[PDB]
From Swiss-Prot:
UniProt record similarity statement: Belongs to the peptidase S8 family.
Root EC class: hydrolase
Subcellular location(s) per record: Secreted
Function of the protein: Has a broad substrate specificity with a slight preference to large hydrophobic amino acid residues at the P1 position.
Residues cleaved off as propeptide: 1-73
Domain Peptidase S8 residues, every copy: 78-384
Entry note: thermal dependence: Thermostable. Highly active at 80 degrees Celsius.
Name the UniProt record assigns to this protein: Tk-subtilisin
Keywords of the record: Calcium, Hydrolase, Protease, Secreted, Serine protease, Signal, Zymogen
MF terms in GO: identical protein binding; serine-type endopeptidase activity
Pfam families per the UniProt record, alphabetical: Peptidase_S8 (PF00082)
Source species: Thermococcus kodakarensis (strain ATCC BAA-918 / JCM 12380 / KOD1)
InterPro entries, per the entry: Peptidase_S8/S53_dom, Peptidase_S8/S53_dom_sf, Peptidase_S8/S53_subtilisin, Peptidase_S8_Asp-AS, Peptidase_S8_Ser-AS, Peptidase_S8_subtilisin-rel, S8pro/Inhibitor_I9_sf, Subtilisin_Carlsberg-like
């Protein structure tokens, strides 16, 4: 009965052979942070902590999906896509700018869904600490991933639905199992994979440009429709690698009606996303103090197997924002041959992605940022306009 823990280490002194020596093993060595996921006897963690080079031993917490199913063959435009004013942007860009990819860390994807396939660029899985690019492993066993993905990127054609950014390339990174449950360790490995991309190297040409570099295959957005209450240092360390790579990170605020967002949404470097309904009210389940809000009730999208389904949750709101991000970056790159900086929470200018989102958002409720809606409901068209402005 080994348990899985995540060790933060000093690479000069940590000796993995010591871990094998007490009956453990290394499951995954992070490429971008100094840490290793290890399996070891519970009764032997006492020892691990004492080994040379072991700075911290964190247990493997759990996060869960933040969407649930709610209780025409020709294409429907789901109401939320219209709410966030995406279709008007498509004349400028549908997100099909070659350097732009959106990584969706979720339950996997129905990679061959006729309304998604053309936009699935890379389908990968990190479950149990093993990185697999086998399609069987990257397929969705829950449906939630396929639905989230569809809200970002379902194709604009004569069937099904249509995403916020219906031409954007998607990386499906499976970090959640069939029940929508995920280990923090897998989720961290998944954020790492979104950075590394298909070629396995963060900055291949070593110019210090990752996101926005056409010579690399890093994602530009990481979208996490999932959350947990634990705040673990190695996971935050990974979020910072991604942020430092120029990648915009977006995550669901959570659904317990709690006064603040779950993790990773609650990190400063992450855009926490709250849920509204078709009446512009905040849903009661929506965790407070989000950064922005978006449609998250009665959301129709793609679902396995080659089907459609209506779900609800902050998980559903999240992809609407990620899709807006993808339109911003795509239109800005299309015009300027570069992307914009990610920005911070406080940001109120047009020179960062986050500043654009905050200043163009539809400010419902009490004037300015407020604990229900954040800065407001994201608006694609106005955002792209500020971007190109
Ligand atoms: Ca890219
Ligand atoms: Ca469609
Ligand atoms: Ca790469
Ligand atoms: Ca580079
Ligand atoms: Ca380059
Ligand atoms: Ca299918
Ligand atoms: Ca407000």
């Amino acid at each position: 009965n080994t348990i899985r823990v995540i060790v933060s280490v000093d690479k000069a002194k940590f000796n993995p052979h010591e871990v094998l020596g007490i009956g453990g093993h290394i499951v995954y060595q992070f490429k971008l942070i100094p840490a290793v996921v290890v399996d070891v006897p519970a009764n032997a963690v006492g020892k691990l902590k004492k080994m040379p080079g072991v700075e911290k031993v964190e247990f493997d917490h759990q996060a869960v999906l933040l969407g649930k199913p709610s209780w025409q063959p020709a294409q429907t435009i789901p109401w939320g896509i219209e709410r966030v004013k995406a279709p008007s942007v498509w004349s400028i860009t549908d997100g099909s700018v070659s350097v732009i990819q959106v990584a969706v860390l979720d339950t996997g994807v129905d990679y061959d869904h006729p309304d998604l396939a053309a936009n699935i660029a890379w389908c990968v899985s990190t479950l149990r600490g093993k990185v697999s690019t086998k399609l069987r492993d990257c397929a969705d066993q829950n449906g939630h991933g396929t639905h989230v993905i569809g809200t970002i990127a379902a194709l604009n054609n004569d069937i099904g639905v249509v995403g916020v950014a219906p031409g954007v390339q998607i990386y499906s990174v499976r970090v959640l199992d069939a029940r929508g449950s995920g280990s923090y360790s897998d989720i961290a490995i998944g954020i790492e994979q979104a950075i590394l991309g298909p070629d396995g190297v963060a900055d291949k040409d070593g110019d210090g440009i990752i996101a926005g570099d056409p010579d690399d295959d890093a994602a530009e957005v990481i979208s996490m429709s999932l959350g947990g209450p634990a705040d673990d240092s190695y996971l935050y360390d990974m979020i910072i690698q991604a942020y430092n790579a120029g990648i915009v990170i977006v995550a669901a605020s959570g659904n317990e009606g709690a006064p603040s967002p779950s993790y990773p949404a609650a990190y400063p470097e992450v855009i926490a996303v709250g849920a509204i309904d078709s009446n512009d009210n905040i849903a009661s389940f929506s965790n407070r103090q989000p950064e922005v809000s978006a449609p998250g009730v009665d959301i129709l999208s793609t679902y396995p197997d080659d089907s459609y389904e209506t779900l609800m949750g902050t998980a559903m709101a999240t992809p609407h924002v990620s899709g807006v991000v993808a339109l911003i970056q795509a239109a800005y790159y299309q015009k300027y041959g570069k992307i914009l900086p990610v920005g911070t929470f406080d940001d109120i200018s047009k020179n960062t992605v986050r500043g654009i989102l905050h200043i163009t958002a539809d400010d419902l409720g009490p004037t300015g940022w407020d604990a229900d809606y954040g800065y407001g409901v994201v608006r694609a068209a106005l955002a792209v306009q500020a971007a190109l402005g």
